[PDB]
Symmetry: D2
Subunit: 253 residues, 4 copies
């Protein structure tokens, strides 16, 4: 039951993915021209061929596909870091999240998927060009129902009340700690992602000032090694992404 | 609206958590005796005092509290590893998951929380004492509605059809690859956690045999460093958990 | 040609080492009493037996044995860190090194071994109990000929001239930068080991002030993983020493 | 007393090094032409200028400069790995080392520097073009006195006797274990560098066969992180070299 306007992932013989809207149009590939209207009426698992006879397999888009093919700026939160945010703050279906700044919306997409259609994410942003980019990513991924972008400076305050988590990727998360203490419910998490150890120190100094409002904070950083596994040789990949940012957690009350 | 039989987390002045069922009983602490009936009628955020005048703050249990206080055996999947499984396989609210072996239920609790009340997890297990331990953990955490434990050897087959993910923490995941190829929907993930590099090699040799059923597999391992952040000194903690297991992902067709 | 008063390493059937001075005495072990005079006249490679028949093999002490069996306080420079100091600063036979503070002498032993009998290490120290501990370790290891300990505060100056390397494990290495610029020959290294990232920042600010005296500084930290290699399972050891200190290098002129 | 035919390091205003032989020639640079005869008669620490007025400072070449500027092939042992070899096997001035294969001579240069003018390194090699490349590097660095290259296959045997260390960067170090057991003195080290975990497993199986000849083997791998230290931000460098090879040590008797 694939209809016109539906999104679909096409998979190459090389295993390359193309995330595509189904329409009566020509799609130009590396490996020939695809007649997209052929997809209509077909099912996931089936395939289409280019004019050169190369086969493209049809998959339902998953969160991994939207995240991988998203339009982005240079600074995003990596899936490995979003993964640890979700895990250590216990982010759950139905949660209400305040986040800032929205950026390209990578973290936002990840979180919106996790809280599900009855959860909510409100993301503050001060750059209208990034707000627009993120909004387009979020509509494209199908999460406009649960995510709202505000063009507003979160250092001036958080309008929301009884929130589950306040999640920051901002230059100065210490300017949000007081607002978060008021906005968060008992047991909710304050979480901040910060590239520099200078940021971590300034954040911790603020959290110490607010020690009657939070449990003991914890700061981590995560590294993921890829393994090269061939018939005659397993070893880690030679180079890795070794640093993106520190992640600090503080539980309210 | 805290009623009798409700679960509650009590937080120490030291920040220690006690995950408790509310009844009219006496609770014995490090810091004196608590009269749990006093919790009844109270609200989250409020507090109770021990007979020695020590204050215990009252929180709603979150997934982090269940995971942290769970009854466990010596071999569990760590939250950092569960986090990366969820992230790289795109595990989402409503998903249908086959898992084995259930173990103590740690990975199962984590996944059950992510898939939500309309998702499902079916966990196979061959040791009835672990099946019982996991079942008691899952009922305690409130997930009996969405998780089912089967006392059955998954090497003999997977009954389920059109599953989103098959997720393994088993000595021999290569003996499940064919069953998973049949059970998984197009685009679903096979994921296996394995402590030893020998397991990774055997698994990859099997996935190569089934290269027509899966995209190119990926194997990772994740390390999380804790930071020590004091007024005058920030540095990583001296010692870390540096290895638990490798994680392999292969996407179906 | 093993004589009385020689030092010798005795190796257990379990592979445990005992670094011992050969005299006509009784040595009490886990595995029985050893008659040490029986070593006299023997050669390296041969063995002695305890009164319970357990065999102790006789080796010549190497630097690894002195380092491993040295009397120490709680804060030393680890061999892995000393290794990188030697490597990245190009520490060589015949070099003249100024070091501070001596501590237990661990770094000093390592460096003294590398510069050889014609190199020299001068180590400054302000605590006389540590100066004595280090001196006893250095005499025991046979390096009194090339190492001198000074009971003097290196923040007040370095007397030495045309030195190859100034090597610091001190709370405030920035108070030594100016003295080191004067003491070092052209192309010599300033090197500083520091546990905290706050120390690294203060040091780098000082080195920026002295940017006309040094090349661009480099700061590293080193992690060594142990592998567990059994017949049926290879994997990294579960836990590791993941942080000791950062190491900063700056080459003079 | 810089005379003609001497080697010198020239340092750029940008901090770039040029390792050069002093002759009456013209040296063409990025920053103008250098009249190299001007160096004659001068001292280390002084400078030459290009015709364009840019200053090049004069340093004595150190092992770090030879290692950094060496002509190499694609596969060398990294200084961090050579560092741990030296450290954990206790490689010392005066040692006699057998090494294979010589490669580009990077490990050989490192080791030759450590053993000093009275130590010896004998390196076996089976490819004549690499033997020649290494020989040219070793003569250039000034170590022809202490290093000998043999065009010979070390799997056929080690001619040398009472050696301190046998040091391997070979596809199959297990084919050398028996020869090393015979060649090594009591307490000498067998050391092997291997990129793949499969090599580590085959090597350990051979060392278990020879367990009456060696103490318990140890396998490590080393990672060095670079830190970025700017006035307003300290953080690890984003990317790192995360794997080169494992290093296995076994002490003879
Ligand atoms: N005070 C503030 N309030 C709201 N947004 C802010 C802010 N200060 C900075 N920002 C925004 O925060 C963003 C940091 S980049 C955030 C990237 C995002 N986490 C992603 O994964 O795609 C920038 O877009 C910046 O404009
Ligand atoms: N073939 C098989 N089918 C089902 N369970 C199996 C199995 N082989 C081993 N097991 C079970 O797999 C488990 C591995 S320990 C699993 C721990 C779990 N992931 C947690 O986080 O708590 C054991 O309980 C073992 O009994
Ligand atoms: N200004 C100063 N001058 C000389 N020594 C100093 C000093 N400030 C601190 N110290 C000494 O520096 C030492 C730091 S611990 C050094 C450990 C040593 N690197 C080892 O490996 O064993 C202490 O012994 C302290 O007493
Ligand atoms: N059996 C054998 N005997 C001697 N050399 C061998 C050998 N098998 C392989 N080799 C050589 O071993 C080398 C591996 S590359 C060694 C690189 C070297 N450690 C460096 O740092 O520069 C190659 O030059 C190869 O020709």
């Amino acid at each position: 039951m694939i209809r016109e306007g539906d999104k679909v992932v096409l998979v190459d013989p090389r295993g390359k993915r193309y995330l595509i809207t189904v329409s009566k149009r020509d799609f130009h590939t590396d490996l020939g021209i695809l007649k997209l209207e052929e997809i209509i009426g077909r099912n996931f698992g089936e395939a289409i061929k280019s004019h050169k006879g190369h086969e493209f397999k049809i998959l339902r888009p998953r969160i991994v596909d939207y995240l991988d093919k998203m339009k982005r700026g240079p600074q995003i939160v990596h899936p490995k870091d979003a993964a640890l945010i979700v895990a250590y703050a216990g982010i759950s279906p139905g949660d209400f999240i305040v986040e800032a700044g929205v950026g390209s919306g990578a973290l936002t997409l990840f979180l919106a998927n996790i809280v599900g259609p009855e959860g909510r994410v409100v993301s503050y942003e001060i750059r209208e060009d990034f707000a627009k980019l993120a909004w387009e990513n979020i509509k494209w991924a199908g999460f406009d129902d649960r995510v709202t972008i505000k063009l507003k400076d979160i250092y001036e305050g958080i309008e929301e009340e009884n929130v589950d988590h306040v999640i920051l990727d901002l230059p100065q998360p210490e300017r949000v700690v007081e607002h978060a203490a008021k906005a968060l419910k008992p047991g909710g998490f304050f979480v901040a992602y910060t590239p520099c150890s200078n940021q971590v120190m300034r954040l911790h100094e603020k959290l110490r000032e607010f020690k009657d409002y939070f449990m003991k904070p914890r700061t981590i950083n995560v590294l993921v090694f890829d393994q090269e596994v061939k018939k005659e040789c397993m070893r880690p990949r030679t180079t890795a992404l070794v640093h993106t940012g520190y992640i600090t957690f503080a539980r309210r009350i």
